[PDB]
Write an enzyme that holds these catalytic residues in place. Structure first.
Site, short mmCIF file in Angstrom:
data_model
loop_
_atom_site.label_atom_id
_atom_site.label_comp_id
_atom_site.label_asym_id
_atom_site.label_seq_id
_atom_site.Cartn_x
_atom_site.Cartn_y
_atom_site.Cartn_z
N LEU A 14 0.81 -1.22 0.00
CA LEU A 14 0.00 0.00 0.00
C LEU A 14 0.84 1.27 0.00
O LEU A 14 0.50 2.25 -0.66
CB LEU A 14 -0.99 0.01 1.17
CG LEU A 14 -2.28 -0.81 1.02
CD1 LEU A 14 -2.98 -1.00 2.36
CD2 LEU A 14 -3.22 -0.19 -0.02
N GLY A 18 7.99 2.32 8.75
CA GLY A 18 7.95 1.03 8.06
C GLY A 18 7.04 1.01 6.84
O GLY A 18 6.84 2.05 6.19
N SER A 19 6.51 -0.17 6.53
CA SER A 19 5.64 -0.35 5.36
C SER A 19 4.22 -0.76 5.74
O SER A 19 4.00 -1.32 6.81
CB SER A 19 6.22 -1.40 4.41
OG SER A 19 6.38 -2.65 5.07
N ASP A 133 3.37 15.13 13.00
CA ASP A 133 3.50 14.80 11.58
C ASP A 133 2.18 15.01 10.83
O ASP A 133 1.85 14.27 9.92
CB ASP A 133 3.96 13.34 11.45
CG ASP A 133 4.65 13.03 10.12
OD1 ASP A 133 4.83 13.92 9.26
OD2 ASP A 133 5.00 11.85 9.94
C1 1P6 Z 1 2.39 4.98 3.94
C2 1P6 Z 1 0.94 4.49 3.93
N1 1P6 Z 1 0.43 4.42 2.55
C3 1P6 Z 1 -0.87 4.02 2.22
C4 1P6 Z 1 -1.74 3.49 3.17
C5 1P6 Z 1 -3.02 3.10 2.78
C6 1P6 Z 1 -3.99 2.58 3.77
C7 1P6 Z 1 -5.32 2.20 3.49
N2 1P6 Z 1 -5.92 2.20 2.24
N3 1P6 Z 1 -5.90 1.84 4.62
N4 1P6 Z 1 -4.99 1.97 5.67
C8 1P6 Z 1 -5.13 1.73 7.02
C9 1P6 Z 1 -4.08 1.99 7.84
C10 1P6 Z 1 -2.89 2.46 7.27
N5 1P6 Z 1 -2.78 2.66 5.97
C11 1P6 Z 1 -3.81 2.44 5.16
N6 1P6 Z 1 -3.38 3.28 1.50
C12 1P6 Z 1 -2.53 3.78 0.62
N7 1P6 Z 1 -1.31 4.15 0.96
C13 1P6 Z 1 0.10 5.41 4.80
C14 1P6 Z 1 -0.19 5.01 6.10
C15 1P6 Z 1 -0.96 5.80 6.94
C16 1P6 Z 1 -1.43 7.01 6.46
F1 1P6 Z 1 -2.18 7.79 7.27
C17 1P6 Z 1 -1.15 7.42 5.16
C18 1P6 Z 1 -0.38 6.62 4.32
#
Ligand code: 1P6
Length: 287
Positions: A14, A18-19, A133
């Protein structure tokens, strides 16, 4: 309820920070399980793991319509690596969502998003957490009518006796969203988060246009020849001298006024998130 690592099926990467990966939690092994988001460390060292577990405790303590939902944790045998399991928010990052639908998202929708970010932040403050952040890159879209703060990787808890947190040895630093005191003294508070919130508002109303981004605009103002530590030096002097991000093209006056109020060098004069959410909801009602 527990999550067995063997039953987490990878679907898609996604993003990196981390990732974060899209996974199906499928213990029935028939591809009907729940799709979740899983966050893990790229470099799971002893210091990072300690920081990550604190992040997890922070997110678990939070329950708000505009804060991503905690689901659980996956533990690994031996070394004790951790995966954080969250709700999957299907419209993805706000940053990409707004870049994809540009101006087809009108001001009233942008103010609905603004109000929700404000509300999520106000709640965070009642827990005495400092996000550090706040930026569109850390906001997720559940659906057309609902965004959520989605990452807490830099969040600190205020000490019981102080209204700021001082970071001794900074790592990851989104300097273009930082209040002057955060750049100069590495001091973080609710007031520095409010500064950052002004930058988020700038971001929304520029529709995250690349050439208009905070880094693009601040580099222009200090000179594109500034490099490394010199950027920080010149940014500080610019901000001390009331250099600010310009008004976004087409941005309503009352919203631009909110930004500039957030970007007050005097920490005590910046507005509170409670007052911001009331103001923003009044704008929406007027429109
Ligand atoms: C870095 C991360 N990138 C993402 C995250 C997600 C995503 C998603 N579709 N649902 N979700 C639930 C918890 C965390 N991340 C996510 N979707 C697209 N890009 C990223 C992580 C947290 C953020 F607030 C923004 C980006």
């Amino acid at each position: 309820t527990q999550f067995e690592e063997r039953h987490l099926k990878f679907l898609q990467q996604l993003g990196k920070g981390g990732s974060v990966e899209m996974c199906r939690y499928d213990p029935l092994q028939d591809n009907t399980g729940e799709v979740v988001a899983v966050k893990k460390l790229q470099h799971s060292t002893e210091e990072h793991l300690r920081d990550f577990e604190r992040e997890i405790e922070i997110l678990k303590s939070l329950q708000h319509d505009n804060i991503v939902k905690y689901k659980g944790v996956c533990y690994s045998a031996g070394r004790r690596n951790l995966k954080l399991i969250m709700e999957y928010l299907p419209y993805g990052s706000l940053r990409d969502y707004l870049q994809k639908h540009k101006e087809r998202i009108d001001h009233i929708k942008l103010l609905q998003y603004t109000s929700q970010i404000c509300k999520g932040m106000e709640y965070l403050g009642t827990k005495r957490y400092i996000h550090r952040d706040l930026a569109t890159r850390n906001i997720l879209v559940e659906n057309e009518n609902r965004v959520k703060i989605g990452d807490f990787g830099l969040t600190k808890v205020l000490p019981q006796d102080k209204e700021y947190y001082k970071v001794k040895e900074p790592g990851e630093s989104p300097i273009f969203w930082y209040a002057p005191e955060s750049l100069t003294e590495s001091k973080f508070s609710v007031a520095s988060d409010v500064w950052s919130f002004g930058v988020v508002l700038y971001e929304l109303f520029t529709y995250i246009e690349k050439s208009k981004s905070p880094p693009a605009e601040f580099m222009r103002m200090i000179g594109n020849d500034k490099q490394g530590q010199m950027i920080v030096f010149h940014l500080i002097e610019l901000l001390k001298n009331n250099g600010r991000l310009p008004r976004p093209d087409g941005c309503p006056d009352e919203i631009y006024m909110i930004m500039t109020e957030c970007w007050n060098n005097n920490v005590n004069q910046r507005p509170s998130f409670r007052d911001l959410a009331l103001r923003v909801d009044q704008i929406r009602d007027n429109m």
